[PDB]
Every structure is written in structure tokens, then in C-alpha cells.
């Protein structure tokens, strides 16, 4: 791998996300309905960081990301996924379909600046050592050119219930430098069964540079009501947590709201400090005098040792394992320490 | 399988896109305890599952059968916390004849006291040193600094309580996606315009099957109405769309 330093250093640019980031949340047909789903979506009119030379720095991955590209000469090659993204954790590697569409979830020893290699292909500089392979899948062969725009590739990176789900859509575009206004939904392509924890990613780009740009936004857990038409295409969406009119739209299951009063949520002042006050006496309660005791009274004449006016460290009861059968009615068997008796 | 993964790093073999002959599970008697939550312990064959999960591992000592939705303990809470909404079940049978070693399989790590606890269904291979007293420890072991793995200890004559009950958790999710894996049924010819009892990839009911004019997308298998009830199905053998 080679680290390219002849790079212009400018601050990130920002644009308007408009109506991007809606995807099919499930694989089920619905029509002439408004269905509310709570999932990771890109907010409407969200603050999206905008990148354009040879511009490709390292970016954060939080809950998930929305990826879209507008390109004319297919420079994007794939992604690195991980915790550290330096061969220390399991990673997802996507090579171009020029050979075959390959997503290999093998354990790779990556170089410290990994990149796919290639106008004819020559170089192959992705990994050296390669063992501990756990998953492989190969999609039907195609070809992504290795050297207004026409081809848009959109990606969503999810880590939900054992699936890494990738969505993509290809459409015409007519903007030079931004995301169009209008609506589209991201279709599922393949359900990849790998339960890994992805917190970091890097974009692979394709010596000379081409004419292309890509955009990355960020997903948060939000509730969206998606409108399915008769034909079965999602044509609009509302982020009900963006603003109160969308909150009303979310509550009423409609994109039109009539004159009236609508209850959409509940306000509550949140506590800012945690105040814990127990009795001044800190004397250790004599549970030791009960449990350690050399002789107990028999079952018919059982003793009764009253405990009062102290603080009782129930921790020695909760964390101990010597008690063979601690099956406990009335209160919880473990978190006893958070009550006054 | 010849060897299964340990209880902290238990394997996860997803099964999809085939026919699941649950007969070999239902009629078998070698399974010592088939105490089965979620679904009936006998008639597994009459459902189609969106996705099936298979967490197989080995537990002995205490907590031999403490793996259950709504249970707590050292093994069931800090190594593999089966969720309290768990839909599925557990096949367990002692493996003295084979898995228990002639001496002792000291190869099933069970990582008692990791940090605080575990939420449902995260495998954690992380070996960070646990600290409870003097914080100066940084990846180093000291006065109150522990390495937490501390593997199991089984012998052929361990006893029924300390006997390894090989756990195989079939964790089913019945409302996640179109069903892909299920039971060995005969599969009859499709009949239209008549009152019939139908089973379409796990969707069951009684009704009349008619030709649909709905434009299903290639990956989309069935539909629901405004009432959130099923009203359309794609036939699983020929990719024709039917209204039900």
C-alpha cells in the first residue's frame, strides 16, 4: 500500500440532504397504506457533510451511514468495515465485479492503507496472508469500469440482528453538484448473514483521477411512516422527529393535517442531578453476627435477631456464590442494595 | 459437529433456503431434555420460519438447565444471556460417551465475571483485564486485576449436575421476513376458484385462490391490506402472484 500525500487540505463542505435516505424497511408488500416503522433512517433536511482533486479522508461511522455517489467513470471500488479497520477485527471486503462480484468475510491481514488494485488490471495489493475464512458469496458476473452524470450507486450499511443489509438503486440524475429533489427508495439486493460489530469504515476510490463525487449522511433511530402506493412504490416519507408538523403527521397517519388540536408527545423536565440520601449512621448492620454465628436455634424454637438503625451492606449477600440455593420471592435476588427497609 | 464452540464465543450457523426435516428432532429419544419454549415440542414440522439460528455450546457444573427466558445466574447472565422474549428452544443431552474427555475437556472457556453483565445475544471474545480495586492496572494484572476466562472443568464421572448437557439453541424469529426454511411436506397441486385450506410458505388459513393483478417486485413475496391482514401471496414454486 502507498500513502498519497499530494492532497489539498480544505475543511468539509455542507449541503442539504433533501428527501434522501429512505429504504425498504422489510420485504413485505403493502399498498394504499401509510405504515409507521422505527428504524435507522437519514433525517430529512439533515446536516450532511459534503466531500468532493482527490478528496477522500477518513470518516466516522456511528449508528450507520447513508452513502450515495454521482459518478461518470465508476471510481468507487468498495469499503472496509470493522472496529479498528486494520486487520485486528473481522472485516467485510468488496472487490469489483470485473473478476466476479465477491463479498468475502474471510479473516484478512490487511496492509496499513488497504486498497483494491488494478487500462488493464495488473496489480493485486489488498492482502498478503489469508486464512480463517468464515463466509463467501458470489453474485452473477458484471463489470464496473476501472477508469450531468448517468450512473448512481447508493449504499446503506446496517448492523441489525445478525444481518449486514446492503441496499442500492440506480437512477438518472440531472444535478451537477448536489442531491436531486424528488423521492426514491432503496431496494434490498442481498441479505448477508454476518453478525459483526461495525463502527468504522473507509471509502475506496479509483495514476489519474476521474470525474466523480460522493456524499455521506448519518442515520439515527427515528420513527418514519412510509406511504406505499397502489402499484407498490414508496413515493414519500415523513421524519416525525424532525419538527412538530411531522410529529403531527406521524400521530395522524396522514400527509395532510386538518384544523384542530393534536397531541403528539409529552413534555417532561428531566433530572440533572442524582441525589441519594440515607441515614447518617454508617455503622455496619450485624448481618455478620447472624450469618457467621457458631450455633443457630432449632426449627421449633428458632431465634429472632432484630436488626435496626444502621446501613446493611447487602453486597456480601448478592455477590457471594457460597449460598447454594438463593431463590428469592418478594424482591429481586441480586439488586437488593437499592432499597431502605 | 465434531467440536462445538465455547459458551462465551458460541458459534452461529444460519440455515436458510432448504427443507428442514424436523422429524429427526421430534421422534428422537437420545435428547435427554427437550423442554421447548416458543413452539410446541412435538409438532415443529407445521411452521415455516423467516430465519433459524443455531447456537450450540456446552454447559455443566451449575446452571445445567438455567438457560431459559427469564433466568439469571453466572452462566446464563454473564456468558450467554438468552433474551426474555426468546422465541425458540433448547435441546440438551449429556455427552459423556464422546464430548466429555477421558481425562477432562479443559477447552470450554466460560468467562465468569467479565465487567458487569451481558445484554441479549452479543458474543464477546474481548479479553480485557477486569479491575475491581486499584485502577493503576492498564492491560496488566495486579492486586485486584483479573484475566476473566477461567475454563470449565469436566471429568467422565463428573455427575449428572456437572454432566455436560450439550445445548443447541434453535432460536426462531417467526415475524421477521418471508419464510425461507421449513418442514418436509408433500406439496400438492395448486387449485384455483375453490374453497380450500391453504398453507403458503407458513401462512395458513382457509380460502379461495384467485389470479392477482398486483405488480410484486422480484424480491417481495407477499402482501397485506390496510387491516394488516394477508391478502396476497407469491407462489413458492412458480413466481406467479395470487390474491387470497
Amino acid at each position, epitope marked *: 500500500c502507498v500513502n498519497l500525500t499530494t492532497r489539498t487540505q480544505l475543511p468539509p463542505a455542507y449541503t442539504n440532504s433533501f428527501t434522501r435516505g429512505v429504504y425498504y424497511p422489510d420485504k413485505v408488500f403493502r399498498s394504499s397504506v401509510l405504515h409507521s416503522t422505527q428504524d435507522l433512517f437519514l433525517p430529512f433536511f439533515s446536516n450532511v457533510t459534503w466531500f468532493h482533486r482527490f478528496d477522500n479522508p477518513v470518516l466516522p461511522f456511528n449508528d450507520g451511514v447513508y452513502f450515495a455517489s454521482t459518478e461518470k467513470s465508476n471510481i468507487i471500488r468498495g469499503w472496509i468495515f470493522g472496529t479498528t479497520l486494520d486487520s485486528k477485527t473481522q472485516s467485510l471486503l468488496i472487490v469489483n465485479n470485473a473478476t466476479n462480484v465477491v463479498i468475502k468475510v474471510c479473516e484478512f491481514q490487511f496492509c496499513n492503507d488497504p486498497f483494491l488494485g488494478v487500462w488493464m488490471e495488473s496489480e493485486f495489493r489488498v492482502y498478503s496472508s489469508a486464512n480463517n475464512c468464515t463466509f463467501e458469496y458470489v453474485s452473477q458476473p458484471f463489470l464496473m469500469d476501472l477508469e450531468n452524470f448517468k450512473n448512481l450507486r447508493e449504499f446503506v450499511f446496517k448492523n441489525i440482528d445478525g444481518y449486514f443489509k446492503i441496499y442500492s438503486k440506480h437512477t438518472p440524475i440531472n444535478l451537477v453538484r448536489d442531491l436531486p429533489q424528488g423521492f426514491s427508495a432503496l431496494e434490498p439486493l442481498v441479505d448477508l448473514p454476518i453478525g459483526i460489530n461495525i463502527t468504522r469504515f473507509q471509502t475506496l476510490l479509483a495514476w489519474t483521477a476521474g470525474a466523480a463525487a460522493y456524499y455521506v449522511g448519518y442515520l439515527q433511530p427515528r420513527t418514519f411512516l412510509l406511504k406505499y402506493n397502489e402499484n407498490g412504490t414508496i413515493t414519500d416519507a415523513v421524519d416525525c422527529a424532525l419538527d412538530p408538523l411531522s410529529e403531527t403527521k406521524c400521530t395522524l397517519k396522514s400527509f395532510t393535517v386538518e384544523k384542530g388540536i393534536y397531541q403528539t408527545s409529552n413534555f417532561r423536565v428531566q433530572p440533572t442531578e442524582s441525589i441519594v440520601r440515607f441515614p447518617n449512621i454508617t455503622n455496619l448492620c450485624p448481618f455478620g453476627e447472624v*450469618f457467621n454465628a457458631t450455633r443457630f436455634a432449632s426449627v421449633y424454637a428458632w431465634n429472632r435477631k432484630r436488626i435496626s438503625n444502621c446501613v446493611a451492606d447487602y453486597s*456480601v449477600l448478592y*455477590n*457471594s*456464590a*457460597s449460598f447454594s440455593t438463593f431463590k428469592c420471592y418478594g424482591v429481586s435476588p441480586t439488586k437488593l442494595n437499592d432499597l431502605c427497609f | 459437529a465434531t467440536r462445538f464452540a465455547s459458551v462465551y464465543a458460541w458459534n452461529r450457523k444460519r440455515i436458510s433456503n432448504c427443507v428442514a426435516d424436523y422429524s429427526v428432532l421430534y421422534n428422537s429419544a437420545s435428547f435427554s431434555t427437550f423442554k421447548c419454549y416458543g413452539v410446541s415440542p412435538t409438532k415443529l414440522n407445521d411452521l415455516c420460519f423467516t430465519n433459524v439460528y443455531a447456537d450450540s455450546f456446552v454447559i455443566r457444573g451449575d446452571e445445567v438447565r438455567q438457560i431459559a427466558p427469564g433466568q439469571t445466574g*453466572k452462566i446464563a447472565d454473564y456468558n450467554y444471556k438468552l433474551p426474555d422474549d426468546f422465541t425458540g428452544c433448547v435441546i440438551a443431552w449429556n455427552s459423556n460417551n464422546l464430548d466429555s474427555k477421558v*481425562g*477432562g475437556n*479443559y*477447552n470450554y*472457556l466460560y468467562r*465468569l*465475571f467479565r465487567k458487569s453483565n451481558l445484554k441479549p445475544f452479543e458474543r464477546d471474545i474481548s*479479553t480485557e483485564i477486569y479491575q*475491581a480495586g486499584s485502577t493503576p492496572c492498564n492491560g496488566v*494484572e*495486579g*492486586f*485486584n486485576c*483479573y*484475566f*476473566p*476466562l*477461567q*475454563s470449565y*472443568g469436566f*471429568q467422565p464421572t463428573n455427575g449428572v449436575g456437572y454432566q455436560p448437557y450439550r445445548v443447541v439453541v434453535l432460536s426462531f424469529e417467526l415475524l421477521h421476513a418471508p419464510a425461507t426454511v421449513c418442514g418436509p411436506k408433500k406439496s400438492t397441486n395448486l387449485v384455483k376458484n375453490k374453497c380450500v385450506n391453504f398453507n403458503f410458505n407458513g401462512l395458513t388459513g382457509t380460502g379461495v385462490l384467485t389470479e392477482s393483478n398486483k405488480k410484486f417486485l422480484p424480491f417481495q413475496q407477499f402482501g397485506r391490506d390496510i387491516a394488516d391482514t394477508t391478502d396476497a401471496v407469491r407462489d413458492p414454486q412458480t413466481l406467479e402472484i395470487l390474491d387470497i
Partner: antibody
Amino acid sequence: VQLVESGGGLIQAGGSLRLSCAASGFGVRNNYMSWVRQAPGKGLEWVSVIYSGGTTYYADSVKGRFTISRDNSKNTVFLQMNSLRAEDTAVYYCAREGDVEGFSDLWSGYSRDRYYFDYWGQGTLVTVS
Amino acid sequence: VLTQPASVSGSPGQSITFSCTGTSSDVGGYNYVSWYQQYPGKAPKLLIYDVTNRPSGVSDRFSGSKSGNTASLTISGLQAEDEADYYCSSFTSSNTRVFGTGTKVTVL
């Protein structure tokens, strides 16, 4: 619980050996695996200890020579001895530290520190000559 | 290296107090001292861990203690089989355990 030991033998000064201690009834993971040498008619001067994972703890007088590892597959602790000196001549005990729930003492819950010693093996005489 | 009292001879039944010196790093500050007993040829067996705590299979007459940099053994009702050296193992003194020399008792 039983502990079998091997590796001790008559060697010239500066040789190499490999001490093997196989544990039946418990493993190298359950409790701390310590090393002690018992010089004829002297105290137990602690040598080393293998924890449940990843330790290089040695005594002040034997730093940088003794190497501690385990084969967990066969439940064997290896102490490879290179560049012998005079004071290492002793009977060596692979010591099992008091495991969790030590003798079912009714106060200690999962605190594995418990820096004392349980039953051990019979010891191997290791002489430098 | 903690220092222990030398060999002595005595009578069964009464109490003998053997005090052994140490440093403030391990015995004076920290409290994980344990004591053992061994017969020539056999491996050492546990007598007292934490001194106050007494494992089972051991006569209850054995008792030990620590005072500052010194650790004391208040052994009671000595007998014939009791003739064995008593070993003091304190805390691991910032991860380096140390022991005492040994107190060989004799009886008439």
C-alpha cells in the same frame, strides 16, 4: 484433585530442561498456576505464577531467564529453564492457588485474588551440577 | 524476606506464641497473609488463609494474627503429630510473593 510432575534431572551447569505439570481434576485456567521452589531446609521462595492468561511475573533474583507458557490442549504448564544458576537448585512445586469458592468459604464471592495455596503435586528435584 | 522464629521444644496443652517479622510494604499494609504446614517429604498443606479464616479438616486450636510488621501465631493445645515447620506467606508485595524461614516445634 491430583497433580503429576516431571522434568527434573541431573544436568551440568548451564543446560536446558522443560518442566511438565499435568493437572487432573482441574485445569490451568480454573485457578492461578504458581511456581515455587523449595530449597532443602529453607523457605518457599516464590518463583513465578501463570494466571488465567498472559503473565510475566517473576522474582527479583530470576528476572529475564524463566519463561512460562501453557498447552491448554493437553492441560500442561511448561516452565522452560535456560541459563541456570546456583540458587535455582531446589524442589519445584507447581502450586494450585485457592480456586473460586475456596473450600466453600462462606464469604468470598467470585473474588479470585485469594492469594494462598491449595493442594499441590509431589514436587520435582531440580539440581544444577 | 520475612524472618521467622527458630526451632523450640515444649509441653503439650498450653499456648505458644511465635511472632515473625516482616516489612510494612506487604504485612503492615496489606492483609492477605496465609500460613501452611508440611511434613518432611510431603508437599505443604494449608492451615490458615487470611489467618482468621480456618479451612475444614484442620483442628480449630490453630489460630494466627498480624500486628504491624509482625505476624503472630497463637497455637493452642499442641500434640505429638504437630511437630512441623510453620510457614508464613503474606500478600504478594506488589506481585512478588515472599515467605518466612520456618518454626520447627519439638515435644517431650
